[PDB]
Design a protein around this ligand. Structure first.
Ligand SMILES: [Mn+2]
Length: 1453
């Protein structure tokens, strides 16, 4: 009591720093005794300590006097009346800028990150107002996770909080009791299943806990279940000869399949059989394949580089014109003394002007200012100002050169200069099969559309002419719109030749230099299909077909062309297979338009008739491999969402359709209203009511078989406005194309959407506030209503608009408040109802993933809910770890799945490679709750609890609130208003109509959700058990138990022999079995998809197909990915990603010769970026299959072992000696002394002298390669340290990598930034330096001992030897992968500890936490900051099984 008060009073002024502001509160704290005053004073002072401590740490003046942002502005004389009311903790005002500090200390990660995000939002809210006011904000907040501060030592404040803690308990004993703010204090600091909350579970968690027991008998005996199965069957079978449907499951006659495929689309694709006819149609389909097959046939051009480099500084209408005189002038002193697209002088910005609008812009810009006297008045000032951007940031020698061309300008020369060159089909030679220059023109008519996002805003014939380079002759483009949007391009040649078409540049990266990879992919393919029936003249037929197909697919990329060629895998899987759904041929049909797509149809049918036509069962394996690969040929299209909005409406629709047929209850409340209880009552009642003849596609579980399942697990047998309307209304008669007006009317979602509170609603609303800016606008609309009456005292929309807007006006007409930013956390769990944890109710939001076929749904929710959901998704994971069938993240189980699959398939037993359908929207947390609160787990107080925590996190998920994404609701309201003002309305367009007759939807909340991926381990658990039960029903009825597996949305069922003899013997039984397994799954929530099969030789478990024995390689699958995945990074890492993906590729059977070609393509891309190819950039382009038994180390060593062939012959026996005498008896530390890494690399000399024989200074000094990251990393502290710290569009990536890597990127010893150009030329021309190439410039072949005026600028200090970086590597490669890496032709914590074993960097590597030779290899890795010798195996997973062509293990070194 009194003793603690006295202790505090004597502790505040005797142990805390004496500050002017702190004293004000210190004295008042000392002057009180009553507990409530003591607490408030102590808490406030504890707040102020951190407040001013962090404000001074930032250096921004603290807001002690509670000065407002407006006050902070006005104390400096800045008058901006009207601003968001904010009270920054620390502020520093300057002439035109502001620094605001918001500070807070939070213990729990969740509350910390929360307060972080809304503090960022609060700062960003006033961003535009601060900017337009003439100042700017310094964005910064002080997120501290501790109380250590300058004003007090740690022990002082720690004991302080202890005393306040104990005095809280004393006060809580007294009548200072606080309802739950007492909790927010105390447990707010004075994972694993937080149970410290109260329990308010009343009158709702009892009905829900009752429906899970009303009807079920979870204890049935061990032989009272058999009698139930035998009476659920044979009550089905006898209702199959008349009742439902013949099983949806029929057999296959391959000819029937092929003919049914052929007769698809009776309408327009109507059996155009003749090959030549099809190809003739093909070569004429779009407008672009009409060129790709057509058979057509430096003083300037550098001045643009200079005229362009000085362009990013300024860009205005008055500019870019006299920036073009400096170019047209250059076009007259080079043709008179003697490109140009015939009226157009290619000006700065890829722009193109008219030679006649110029030469008339002057003479009225110049004349407004004796014209010949007025000559040179601007052509000289421009030179002077551009040269004003001098060696300032290294303005290079290009400057005086222009002083020769430009000053030749005269008004007797600009009388005709543009008047001199006054000059303002093709066909389709089809024989362009197999002609490498028919794709080699795509590989250059895409780079002229790809490097076209690289234009800028830049404000007739104003057309952004790029250049189609090619051998010698060059064409153009002509378009008018930039960005990543669509526009109508053109081409131009020597004759006009408007080959107009319409495409999207983002889609065209795949062929951007790949002319020799595709032509060998499509050539290897046809090396599989050298088959006996086709040896007649059809190989040419197939070859022309396949090439004319790949051309269409690359040349006309679009979603349908992907979904189609993807679906053509199901048909072939069926043709080789032996049963199949009967509703299949409606799983293949699209709405083909755009004759390209129809011709793709015809080509596919031609391929299928040819290969799968007569003479079957002779080489079907090869034909199957061929065709599945042609199926995967779909990946060549980019997976990048053709449009955004029309790919959000689709995702929302795919979410919201089943809810249309079940129930939804738009926009619930935070407190579950009676209506929600009624609707959930009804939905549970229906969900548990599904008779023994199910509607076959609707969510439901039948409480007569569900009882059997739960009871067979519990038994031990299956184991082992008044302003809104007015604002729109006044402007309506103030705004009087009209589609902008339609937008204006559809901007009306303010008198219909005002939901939630929090953050729901996400510019002209504020613009009218500043636009009007009149005297009295914030009171009632009395004046506004007066104008409307006094006014009246493509036009119908205006009158009904006044009718609507007149309609609108008629119908429309204390706690720790300050210490909130301080230790007190406002929100946190407390007493929780059965709906939610009292802070919220498990909010969510959905967006689409990006995939090949169809965009897949994704649920993303804020971090607290992502913390809670982790508890369920881990409890169920640990649960299923006891059962041995699932395979989702149990990776060790996948290998056994593969082994069993192979042992099965090898013999001829079935594989019912099913795939379930609508797995997202046909599962409900209710079902897992039913399944759990009915299981009978063992002894209590350690299982019996945590069950009542999983089964109350689930009950939380039940009532989630997904969000209607804002663009979707905007679009649907547009559609509604368009329809109403002025059919084809899909179902989800009518619900908006009813509700917007009343109130808008915002949130949707229903039982059948199972957020895709959210509970994706709970789903796996359920599926595993259900399959383990159905494969018991089938066992008791028919007589065999077929094993299964699962992924959470895939499956398999490897029936044994006794259920495989029947298909050959009698299919009329196994047909019934595949009907019954498809029926019970219907009773439960498992709906088998029509894409399933039961192939006696085929399989498909998570996309790893099979054939008798071996695996279908899926060549095109991996090639299509390696040719992608080129991301903007450091090229020494961009070429790491590919050297991983190529190892992945050669894991499966991509042949080595295509791998080299992929690598050559990537190197060629870099070389196009103008980036020197130092020998460590991308791996050897001469590879044995040696991707096995070799790390990246071995490739790079092998490269240096041939880029300098006989120098690296001595430094390989020196290393032999070093390794011979390092492991056994010596160095092990003194080698770090001889590493000498502090100083220069004479180490080679002293270390050759140390133990070994003659070694000249040549083999060391001579080979020396330019290295860009020598002294610092280059702009856009070792490497392995950064990686360990890290373990605490794609065609607008390249179009950026080629922009930054050419500019000032490299850095110097004194933070100086240089180009690659000057640095790469000086080493070649301006020294006794020899800089010749070997396919990669190993600059400065000599650098004699580096005896020189060293550090000239940088180009001599900036280049390190080679035969040393060969030594350190060719050592690291000798403990990691054996001894032979010299002879002539493990995990994170470890590495952290052996990094600590030299403790100096641990001081930086430690605080981010909230063997025999490994020391040496870690050292060598830490020094060599370029590749990976250790840090590799901890970033990129290697592969386990390797098989590649046996004709590559024969050509080996
Ligand atoms: Mn599958």
């Amino acid at each position: 009591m009194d003793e603690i008060i006295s202790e505090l009073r004597e502790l505040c002024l005797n142990y805390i720093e004496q500050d002017e502001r702190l004293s004000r509160q210190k004295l008042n704290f000392l002057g009180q005794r009553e507990p409530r005053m003591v607490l408030i004073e102590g808490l406030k002072l504890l707040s102020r300590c951190i407040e001013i401590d962090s404000a001074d740490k930032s250096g921004c003046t603290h807001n002690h006097d509670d000065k407002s942002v407006e006050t902070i502005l006005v104390e400096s004389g800045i008058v901006c009346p009207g601003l968001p009311l904010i009270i920054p903790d620390g502020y520093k005002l300057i002439d035109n800028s502001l620094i605001l500090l918001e500070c807070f200390v939070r213990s729990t990660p969740a509350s910390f990150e929360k307060k972080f995000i809304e503090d960022t939002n609060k700062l960003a809210c006033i961003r535009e107002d601060l900017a337009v006011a003439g100042v700017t904000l310094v964005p910064i907040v002080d997120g501290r996770c501790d109380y250590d501060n300058s004003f007090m030592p740690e022990w002082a404040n720690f004991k302080f909080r202890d005393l306040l803690f104990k005095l809280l308990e004393y006060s809580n004993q007294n009548e200072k009791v606080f309802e739950e703010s007492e909790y927010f204090r105390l447990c707010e600091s004075l994972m694993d299943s937080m149970k410290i909350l109260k329990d308010a579970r009343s009158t709702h968690n009892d009905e829900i806990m009752r429906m899970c027991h009303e009807g079920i008998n979870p204890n049935m005996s061990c032989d009272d279940v058999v009698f139930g199965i035998n009476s659920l069957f044979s009550r089905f079978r006898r209702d199959l000869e008349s009742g439902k449907l013949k099983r949806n499951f029929q057999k296959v006659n391959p000819e029937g399949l092929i003919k049914e495929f052929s007769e698809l689309y009776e309408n327009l694709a109507d059996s155009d059989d003749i090959l030549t006819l099809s190809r003739e149609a093909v070569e004429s389909c779009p407008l672009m394949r009409f060129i790709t097959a057509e058979t057509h046939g430096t003083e300037y051009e550098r001045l643009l580089s200079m005229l362009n480099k000085v362009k990013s500084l300024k860009l205005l209408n008055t500019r870019r014109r006299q920036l073009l005189n400096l170019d047209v002038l250059c076009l007259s002193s080079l043709i008179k003394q003697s490109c140009y697209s015939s009226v157009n002088d290619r000006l700065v910005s890829f722009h193109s002007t008219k030679e006649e609008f110029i030469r008339l812009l002057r003479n009225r810009k110049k004349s407004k200012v004796r014209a010949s006297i007025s000559e040179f008045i601007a052509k000289i000032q421009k030179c002077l100002l551009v040269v004003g951007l001098s060696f300032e940031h290294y303005g290079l020698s290009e400057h005086l050169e222009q002083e020769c061309h430009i000053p030749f300008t005269e008004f007797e020369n600009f009388m005709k200069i543009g008047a001199h060159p006054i000059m303002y089909y093709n066909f389709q030679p089809s024989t362009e099969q197999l002609k490498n220059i028919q794709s080699l023109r795509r590989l250059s008519s895409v780079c002229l559309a790809l490097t076209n996002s690289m234009k800028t805003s830049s404000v007739c014939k104003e057309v952004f002419c790029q250049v189609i380079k090619l051998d010698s002759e060059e064409y153009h483009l002509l378009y008018q719109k930039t960005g990543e949007s669509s526009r109508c391009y053109s081409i131009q040649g020597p004759d006009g030749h408007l080959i107009s078409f319409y495409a999207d540049p983002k889609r065209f990266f795949l062929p951007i230099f790949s002319d020799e990879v595709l032509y060998n992919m499509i050539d290897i393919m046809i090396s599989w299909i050298r088959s006996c029936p086709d040896l007649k003249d059809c190989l040419t037929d197939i070859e022309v077909a396949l090439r004319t197909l790949l051309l269409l697919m690359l040349t006309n990329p679009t979603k349908r062309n992907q979904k189609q060629v993807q679906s053509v895998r199901y048909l072939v899987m069926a043709i080789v297979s032996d049963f199949s759904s009967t509703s299949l041929m409606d799983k293949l049909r699209e709405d083909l338009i755009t004759p390209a797509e129809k011709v793709v149809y015809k080509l596919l049918r031609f391929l299928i008739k040819t290969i799968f036509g007569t003479g079957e069962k002779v080489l079907l394996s090869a034909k199957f491999k061929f065709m599945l690969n042609v199926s995967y040929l779909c990946h060549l299209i980019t997976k990048e969402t053709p449009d955004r909005l029309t790919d959000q409406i689709k995702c929302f629709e795919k979410f919201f359709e089943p809810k249309s047929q079940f129930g939804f209850f738009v926009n619930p409340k935070e407190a579950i209203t009676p209506e929600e209880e009624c609707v959930f009552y009804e939905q549970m009642k229906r969900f548990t009511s599904k008779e023994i003849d199910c509607q076959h596609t609707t969510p439901g579980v039948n409480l007569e078989a569900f009882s059997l399942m739960v009871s067979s697990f519990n038994n031990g047998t299956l184991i082992f406005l008044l302003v809104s309307a007015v604002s729109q209304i006044t402007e309506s008669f103030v705004r009087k194309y009209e589609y902008k007006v339609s937008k204006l009317v559809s901007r009306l979602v303010i008198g219909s959407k005002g939901e939630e509170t929090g953050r729901s609603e996400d510019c002209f609303d504020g613009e009218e506030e500043t636009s009007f800016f009149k005297s009295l606008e914030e009171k009632v609309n009395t004046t506004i209503a007066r104008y409307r009456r006094g006014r009246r005292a493509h036009l119908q929309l205006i009158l009904t608009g006044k009718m609507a807007h007149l309609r609108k006006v008629i119908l429309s007409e204390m706690s720790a408040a300050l210490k909130n930013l301080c230790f007190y956390s406002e929100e946190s769990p407390t007493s929780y109802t059965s709906v939610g944890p009292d802070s919220g109710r498990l909010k969510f939001a959905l967006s689409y993933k990006e995939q090949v076929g169809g965009n897949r749904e994704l649920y993303i929710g804020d971090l607290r809910t992502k913390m809670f959901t982790r508890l369920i998704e881990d409890y169920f994971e640990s649960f299923s770890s006891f059962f041995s069938g699932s395979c989702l993240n149990n990776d060790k189980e996948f290998e056994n799945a593969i082994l069993s699959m192979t042992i099965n398939v090898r013999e001829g037993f079935l594989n019912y490679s099913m795939d379930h359908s609508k797995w997202g929207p046909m599962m409900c947390p209710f079902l897992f709750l039913m399944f759990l609160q009915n299981l009978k787990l063992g002894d209590d107080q350690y299982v019996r609890s945590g069950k009542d925590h999983v089964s109350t996190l689930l009950t939380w998920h039940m009532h989630k609130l997904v969000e209607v994404p804002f663009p979707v609701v905007n679009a649907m309201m547009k559609s509604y208003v368009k329809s109403k003002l002025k059919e084809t309305t899909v179902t989800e367009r009518i619900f908006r109509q009813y509700f917007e007759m009343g109130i808008v939807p915002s949130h949707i909340s229903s039982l059948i959700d199972m957020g895709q991926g959210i509970l994706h381990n709970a789903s796996d658990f359920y599926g595993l058990l259900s399959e383990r039960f159905i494969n018991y029903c089938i066992g008791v009825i028919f007589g065999e138990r077929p094993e299964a597996y699962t992924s959470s949305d895939d499956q398999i069922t490897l029936f044994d022999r006794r259920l495989s003899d029947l298909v050959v013997s009698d299919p009329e039984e196994v047909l019934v079995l595949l009907e019954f397994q498809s029926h019970l799954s219907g009773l439960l929530n498992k709906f088998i998809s029509p894409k399933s099969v039961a192939g006696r030789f085929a399989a498909e478990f998570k996309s790893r197909f099979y054939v008798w024995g071996e695996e279908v390689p899926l060549l095109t699958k991996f090639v299509s990915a390696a040719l992608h995945n080129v991301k903007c990074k450091e090229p020494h890492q961009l070429c790491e990603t590919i050297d991983t993906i190529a190892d992945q590729a050669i894991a499966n059977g991509v042949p080595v010769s295509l791998v080299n070609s992929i690598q050559r393509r990537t190197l060629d891309l870099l070389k196009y970026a103008n980036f020197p190819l130092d020998p460590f950039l991308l791996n050897t382009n001469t590879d044995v299959k040696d991707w096995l038994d070799g790390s990246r180390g071995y490739r790079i060593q092998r490269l240096i072992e041939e880029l300098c062939p006989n120098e690296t012959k001595v430094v390989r026996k020196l290393v032999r000696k070093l390794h011979h005498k390092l492991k056994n008896g010596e160095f092990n530390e003194e080698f770090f002394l001889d590493l000498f890494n502090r100083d220069k690399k004479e180490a080679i000399l002293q270390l050759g002298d140390l133990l070994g024989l003659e070694e000249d200074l040549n083999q060391l000094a001579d080979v020396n390669w330019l290295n860009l990251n020598e002294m610092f990393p280059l702009r856009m502290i070792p490497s392995l340290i950064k990686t360990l710290q890290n373990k605490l569009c794609i065609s607008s990536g390249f179009i950026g990598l080629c922009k930054t890597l050419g500019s000032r990127c490299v850095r110097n010893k004194n933070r100086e930034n240089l180009y690659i150009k000057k640095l790469l030329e000086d080493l070649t021309t301006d020294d006794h330096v020899t800089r010749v190439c070997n396919r990669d410039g190993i600059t400065l072949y000599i650098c004699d001992k580096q005896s020189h005026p060293e550090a000239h600028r940088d180009h001599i200090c900036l280049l390190r030897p080679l035969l040393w970086d060969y030594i350190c590597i060719s050592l690291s490669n000798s403990f990691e992968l054996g001894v032979w890496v010299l002879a002539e032709p493990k995990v994170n914590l470890n590495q952290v500890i052996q990094s600590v074993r030299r403790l100096y960097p641990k001081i930086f590597e430690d605080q981010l936490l909230p063997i025999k030779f490994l020391d040496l290899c870690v050292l060598i890795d830490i020094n060599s900051e370029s590749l990976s010798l250790i840090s590799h195996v901890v970033k990129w997973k290697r592969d386990e099984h390797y098989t590649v062509l046996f004709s590559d293990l024969a050509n080996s070194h």
